[PDB]
Amino acid sequence: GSTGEDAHLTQYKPKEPVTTRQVRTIVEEVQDGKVISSREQVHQTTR
């Protein structure tokens, strides 16, 4: 009987009892994936 196969990430978000940083507000924006219109490209199914 062959063994199974899977994957996982060893890294994880550390949960501290108290954070020094106030973290009043956060941001997350990049140039990539801007999506100006996404109409120039043409896609269709194999049918």
DSSP states along 1-47: ---------S------SS-SS---------STT--S-S-SS------
| CB neighbours of residue 4 within 10 Å | 5
Question: Which CA distances in Å does 26 have to 14, 15, 22, 23?
Answer: 18, 18, 11, 7
